[PDB]
């Protein structure tokens, strides 16, 4: 079995410039490549931390209703070795959004696409914030491909 990729999609509104995506797709030796192709930052008030949050977004786009940071470990926000920070700070152990655009690719070894496990992201959101901690835009994570099953094609 492999569980299926994920992808957080950034819709530019009055509220933020901000649009692109982040994918999640399984890869090799245990981890999840993550694609991050993001746009329209206001880069003067970055670098920008970003996480995967336990609530979703809804219909609203209220990124405060995406509650706290996904942390079924308990892992500290500052940290010396990737494996202590929080499942969900992609930001604290893969570097911080910056620039206006911002393009990267990296493995993660800590979230999971398997939603038999502690550490699976699916259903949770992505928020992105200003250095100060300001939530500028948010994203749900959701399934990426249309069609799954070991008959289908997509
Ligand atoms: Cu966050």
Avoid: W
């Amino acid at each position: 079995m492999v569980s299926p990729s994920l992808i957080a999609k950034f819709e530019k509104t009055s509220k933020s410039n901000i649009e692109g995506t982040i994918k999640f797709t399984p890869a090799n030796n245990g981890t999840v490549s993550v694609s991050v192709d993001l746009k329209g930052l206001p880069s003067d008030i970055g670098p920008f931390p970003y996480h995967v949050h336990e609530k979703p977004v809804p219909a609203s786009k209220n990124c405060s209703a995406t509650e706290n940071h996904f942390n079924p470990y308990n892992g500290t926000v500052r940290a010396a070795t990737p494996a202590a920070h929080q499942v969900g700070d992609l930001a604290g152990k893969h570097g911080n959004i910056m620039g206006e655009s911002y393009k990267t690719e990296y493995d993660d070894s800590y979230i999971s696409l398997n939603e038999k496990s502690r550490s699976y992201i699916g259903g949770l959101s992505i928020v992105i914030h200003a250095n100060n901690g300001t939530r500028l835009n948010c994203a749900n994570i959701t399934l990426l491909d249309e069609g799954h099953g070991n008959a289908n094609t997509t």
